[PDB]
């Protein structure tokens, strides 16, 4: 990449919720391995971020890129209406064995936003096959879903800006967001503001949508797997269909495999994407139990109405295939577990810098988050300075490093961190 | 693929607008190279479906292949937010340089349901950026734009089921279908419904949002392109926005490179997609002009507020470049003019057929709607049988196979058509 590139992209090129008046600067990646990003000018970051949950095996992983180049051999694309192939086929096969019992319909979609709109619309076809009029959906503050309309309806009202969709966008119950904190102690009274939502709406929700564990781009919270339980029940005495969105905390960054494991429950629907295929490209994953499926294709349609163009892209489910073999070897399992010590153990010292007001860890996610909002040119200057790559974002500072890093890597990150939050310099107001 | 294969898929595996308790018939594909797919038994078909459209340059591209595999090696993937990387940039330069001149920003998704939901949403932030009270949107009947919720909503009310969604979906305003047909009488009562349907509305509406010329999956329709004009002054002398979707006519399906081109007028906003990346992978693109991008990025939000996880998918990205970078060989176009006049002269003799309906040819694009419903499980064995994939739907079987078709093999695509339109058997009254 050249200056005349550069140029180019801030003048015409939009970047992940960014202004094409007053872009700040963006930093030029050309190749990236291992647990590393390279820039233009050979400086290599280490990776922090997997790419937002993403990468959760590096990047150029060996593995993924041998089942990428044979998928592409045989065709890295073919039309799936209606026709099948093995790859998709494999795929669904994984999925199905490693989630929960019930949950054996799977609709594969290309990214987490149409995701989420499939599980939400599946809620709606599933009650208007029933004779029920249920068009509300139940979820969480602080919650994120997607960017696509549907799932923006259940997106944190103020952090999203759905002032600017007053009007357009349609009004669903939001329950208090959970206070209980993952690995602390259950308050009762956290249950109210949920408790009256269901019970002034309770013949109208649809189903109840929320992260598992995680509440991840709504703020990195951390709230208790007793909160799950809770959900569980109600769902089932009400009927009412529960939704987890683990496209964020699926495939063990938390962990555990999946994040419901965390209350040992199970959601009638699960929403999975992003660390699907390794952060390799996009692919996306809705699965349900067969008494949905079933109670959605015999209603007034005779099929659930969804089918994107590329739905099942061999090419992608090739990558998904490879990284859930990375899985099944269960390494990760000891990846996550010594990422976490080292996250909790090397995050301590933040707590005590007058400008953190929490740090949390749960897996191989770690949580510093500061009373001001950082100076994000300044900040994401001095990350890269440093040889790190960071996304730091409004008052949180956090990791989510691939599954692969090496101790003295992540230990960089980590004093990055700290040497960052201790001085008032690259924070604002 | 083995015999436990194809019923794990019948049984788990959701395919699009699909019933799990009574799927029909599907093929197994386990390769394709150029414009044949084979089956798991060596049967070879010839595509005269491009995998809906997408797949312009066949299957098993060489130059598709090589930029792939070429990027794989750098990187699949990387995050975009906020990062760049030489493949984002150059399709911009590319998308920018080839559409009509105010079309130079652009936002990268994932696909074309998103694109179109990215559209709309520029559209509603315009408006409140300018303190306007315009929500709604204006369409045309038997468009389609999308299966997500707010792409949804502009899709034909009826063909989509609109009442399975009462009140969810934000209701709209539809002028009837355009009358008038591609190469034809252009007769001024067309515009009556539309003139009458701004007329109430037209300090309301942000947006008209339209296919141009070619109606996709809605009907396979071609209307005449003084309607694309006659629509660009209204909407330039109301101020209101005006999106093309060219998601399935972009990239000279219909004889121009973009269908805009037919009527001489450019967008406001253009949702690209399919076709862009040769029907690889999926990949999107929103482009709009520097008012639109400028009037909201100096809005309440301080950013178009949209950014998915894989925004800026540098493999996808290459796959697109090569794609493109065929294209600008230019034998695209004599290859869909002749294309165009061999569906001209085969499907002739499909208007003695008693079933047939309709023969229309706009590019490299053959339509026969029938007078009755297809027998979607026998048409679509018959086919295969024919030693062609021609995918049918409701009233309609059409073509629109790559650009490389060989005279030879459209012949079959043709031959197999005219067949199937005789008798009544593969219909179901
Ligand atoms: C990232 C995320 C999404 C969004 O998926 P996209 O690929 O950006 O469309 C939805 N839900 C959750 C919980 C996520 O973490
Ligand atoms: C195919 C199509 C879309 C949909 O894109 P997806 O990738 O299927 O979500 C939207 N609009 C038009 C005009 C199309 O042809
Ligand atoms: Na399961
Ligand atoms: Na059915
Ligand atoms: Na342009
Ligand atoms: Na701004």
Redesign the interface.
């Known amino acids: 990449?050249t200056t005349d590139?550069?140029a180019?992209?801030e003048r015409?090129?939009?970047?992940?919720?960014?202004?094409?008046?007053?872009?700040?600067?963006?930093?030029?990646?050309?190749?990236?391995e291992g647990c590393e990003?390279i820039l233009s000018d050979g400086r290599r970051l280490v990776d922090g971020?997997s790419?937002?949950?993403?990468?959760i095996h590096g990047?150029?992983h060996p593995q993924?890129?041998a089942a990428?180049?044979s998928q592409?051999?045989?065709?890295?694309?073919?039309?799936?209406?209606?026709?099948?192939?093995?790859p998709?086929?494999e795929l669904?096969?994984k999925l199905?064995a490693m989630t929960p019992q019930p949950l054996?319909?799977?609709?594969?979609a290309?990214?987490?936003?149409?995701a989420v709109?499939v599980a939400?619309?599946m809620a709606?076809?599933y009650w208007?096959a029933k004779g029920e009029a249920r068009?509300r959906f139940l979820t969480f503050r602080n919650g994120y879903h997607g960017?696509?309309?549907?799932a923006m309806?259940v997106c944190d009202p103020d952090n999203?800006?759905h002032?600017?969709?007053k009007?357009?966008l349609?009004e669903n119950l939001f329950a208090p967001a959970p206070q209980s904190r993952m690995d602390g102690e259950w308050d009762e009274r956290d249950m109210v503001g949920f408790a009256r939502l269901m019970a002034a709406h309770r013949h109208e929700i649809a189903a109840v949508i929320i992260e598992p564990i995680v509440q991840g781009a709504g703020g990195m919270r951390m709230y208790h797997p007793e909160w799950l339980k809770r959900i569980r029940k109600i769902c089932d005495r009400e009927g009412i269909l529960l939704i987890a969105d683990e496209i964020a905390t699926g495939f063990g960054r938390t962990g555990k495999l999946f994040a419901c494991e965390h209350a040992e429950i199970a959601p009638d629907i699960l929403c999975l994407?992003?660390a699907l295929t390794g952060?390799?490209?996009?692919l996306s994953a809705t699965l349900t139990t067969?008494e949905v499926?079933?109670t959605?294709?015999?209603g007034?349609?005779?099929?659930?109405?969804?089918?994107?163009?590329?739905?099942?892209?061999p090419?992608?489910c090739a990558?998904a295939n490879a990284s859930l073999a990375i899985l099944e070897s269960g390494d990760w399992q000891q990846q996550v577990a010594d990422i976490e010590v080292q996250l909790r153990e090397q995050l301590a010292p933040a707590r005590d810098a007058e400008m953190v007001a929490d740090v949390r860890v749960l897996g191989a996610i770690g949580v510093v988050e500061t009373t001001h909002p950082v100076n994000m040119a300044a900040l994401?200057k001095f990350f890269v300075e440093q040889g790190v790559?960071i996304?730091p974002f409004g008052k949180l500072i956090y990791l989510m490093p691939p599954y692969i890093i090496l101790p003295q890597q992540l230990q960089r990150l980590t004093a990055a961190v700290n040497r960052a939050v201790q001085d008032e310099t690259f924070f604002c107001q």
């Not at 790419?51 to 990468?55: F, G, H, I, L, R």
């Open positions: 990449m590139d550069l180019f992209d015409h090129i939009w970047h992940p919720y960014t202004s094409m008046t007053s872009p700040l600067p963006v930093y030029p990646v050309v190749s990236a990003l971020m790419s937002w949950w993403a990468a990047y150029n993924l890129n990428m180049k592409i051999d045989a065709m890295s694309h073919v039309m799936f209406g209606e026709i099948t192939h093995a998709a086929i669904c096969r199905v054996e319909c799977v609709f594969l290309d990214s987490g936003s149409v709109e939400m619309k709606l076809q208007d068009d960017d696509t309309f549907g309806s999203s800006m002032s600017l969709w009007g357009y349609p994407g992003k952060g390799t490209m996009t067969r499926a079933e959605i294709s015999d007034e349609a005779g099929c659930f109405m969804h089918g994107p163009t590329f739905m099942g892209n090419l992608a990558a994401q790559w996304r």
